[PDB]
Amino acid sequence: AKAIRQTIANLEPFMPQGMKVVYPYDTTPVVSASIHEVVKTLGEAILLVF
Amino acid sequence: LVTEGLNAGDKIITEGLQFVQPGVEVKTVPAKN
Asked: Which residues cross the membrane (chain A)?
């Protein structure tokens, strides 16, 4: 997904005037927030057992 | 020939079309050919 963001960032300035690229649907924050919940619950687990 | 779209005394571009894109402030020079 980050490579697609950088590819659109490469192809962005050569578009005609008045055309902008928008990102309505995305599952990158779902996966990112889920793996961040997992990392922080592992940190809470190791610190609370400590 | 143009019938509508340009006016009298405007300035159109012959040299340097690979370097430009509409909507940027740019240096002008009168071209040779």
From this structure: 38-50
Residue type, B21: Q
Resolution of the structure in the document, Å = 3.6
What distances in angstroms separate CA A46 from CA A13, A17, A34, A35, A50, one per listed residue? Answer: 48, 54, 18, 17, 6
Is any Cβ of chain B less than 8 angstroms from the Cβ of A14?
Answer: yes
- Residues of B in Cβ contact (< 8 Å) with A17: 22-23
This structure was determined by cryo-EM
Reference B28, options B13, B17, B10, B9; nearest CA is B13
